[PDB]
């Protein structure tokens, strides 16, 4: 009589199945072509 | 019900979530630049 | 006969609750190689 | 009548996070063959 | 009276992750002339 | 097997 077999209480996985870890970005924007401003 | 739990609602196929962000992209081409004054003087 | 409700719960805690950042730090900068070619 | 059922859960293709989808193809730029030596 | 096997009322659906976008080749474009003009 | 298996 006490509850008719809750099927996985509709689902177990809580926080598991959420954000896992911060990203590192496609690439921290690659600096342009720097170097020598040859002159003088 | 006469089948606790019971077959239930099918579906755990897994939506084909969008592929992660692009790989290392780049405007296809070589950053060429013509040189400088040629004949020195 | 009964069968109770032992079931583990929490599935809603993982409803595709992605947290991995979408966009941050994208662009860069340093690119003035010889722009100061200055004669 | 038939206490139970769902022995196989409905239709779980994976029940979680199937294989990752086709990663976008990042464009391929090339190096910076910028200013070159100017013998002239 | 069958079993309650499988998953909560049948399976818990989900979403296939996404493969991190295929790389490319970062860089820059230009005309790599050896000299703009002889002096 | 009346109300639950000693765990929720």
Q: Which chains touch A (3 or more CB pairs under 8 A)?
A: B, C, D, E, F
What residues 1-20 of chain C have any CB closer than 8 A to a CB of chain D?
1, 3
Sort out which chain C residues have CB atoms less than 8 A from A22's CB and list them: 20-21
Cβ within 8 Å, pair D10-B6: no
User: Nearest 5 degrees, angle CA C22-CA E17-CA E13?
Assistant: 120
Q: What is the DSSP secondary-structure string of chain A?
A: ---B--SGGGB--SSTTB-------S-S----B-S-----
Cα gap D5→A29, rounded to integer Å = 55
In angstroms, the Cα distances linking D33 to A11, A25, B29, D27, D36 are 57, 27, 10, 18, 8
Put simply, the answer to whether A6 touches B5 (Cβ < 8 Å) is: yes
| b/e sequence C1-32, b meaning 16+ C-beta within 10 Å | eebbbebebbbeebbeebeeeeeeeeeeeebe
Q: C20, E20 in Cβ contact below 8 A?
A: no
Q: Which residues, at least 6 apart from D16, have a Cβ–Cβ distance to it below 8 Å?
A: A13, A17, B12, B14, E12, E14
Residues of D in contact with A7 (CB under 8 A): 6
Question: Residue A24 contacts by C-beta under 8 Å, 6 or more apart in sequence?
Answer: none
Q: Which residue in chain D has the smallest CA separation from A27?
A: D26
Burial class of residue D14 in the structure, from the number of CB atoms within 10 Å of its CB (0-12 exposed, 13-18 middle, 19+ buried): middle
Chain breaks in chain F (C to N over 2.5 A) after: none
Chain position carrying tokens 């790989």: B23
Q: How far apart are CA B31 and CA D38, in angstroms?
A: 17
* DSSP-assigned letters across all residues of C1-39: ---B----B-GGG-SSB--S-SSSS------BSSTT---
| A27 in Cβ contact with E23 (< 8 Å) | no
How was this structure determined? It was done by cryo-EM
Q: CB of D3 within 8 Å of any CB in chain C?
A: yes
Residue E13, Cβ density class (10 Å: 0-12 exposed, 13-18 middle, ≥19 buried):
buried
Buried-state track B6-27, b at ≥16 Cβ within 10 A, e below 16: bbbbbbbbbbbbbbbbbbbbbe
* Min Cα–Cα distance to chain B from E20, Å: 3
Q: What phi and psi, each to the nearest 5 degrees, are found at residue F4?
A: 180, 165
- Contact by Cβ (8 Å): B4, A2: no
Q: Taking a C-beta distance cutoff of 8 angstroms, is the pair D4, E9 a contact?
A: no
Distance, in Å, from the CA atom of E1 to the CA atom of B40, rounded to the nearest integer, reads 97
The data reach a resolution, in angstroms, of 9.8
Closest chain A residue to C30, measured at CA? A31
Sequence-separated (6 or more) residues with CB below 8 Å from residue F6 = none
Chosen for mutation from C16, C23, C26 (greatest number of chain E CBs closer than 10 Å) is C16
| Closest of D5, E1, A5 to residue B6, by C-alpha | D5
Q: Say if CB B12 and CB D10 are below 8 A apart.
A: yes
B31 token code pair:
């950053």
Judged by CB atoms closer than 8 Å, whether chains meet at C3 and B36 is answered as: no
**In angstroms, rounded to a whole number, what is the distance separating the alpha carbons of residues D13 and E20?**
22
Residues E29, B29 contacting (CB under 8 angstroms): yes
């Amino acid at each position: 009589p006490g509850s008719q077999g809750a099927p996985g209480l509709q689902g177990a996985p809580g926080a598991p199945g959420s954000q896992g870890a911060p990203g590192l970005q496609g690439a921290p924007g690659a600096p342009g072509s720097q170097g020598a401003p040859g002159l003088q | 019900q006469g089948a606790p739990g019971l077959q239930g609602a099918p579906g755990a196929p897994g939506s084909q979530g969008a592929p992660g962000l692009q790989g290392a992209p780049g405007a296809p081409g070589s950053q060429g630049a013509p040189g400088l004054q040629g004949a020195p003087g």
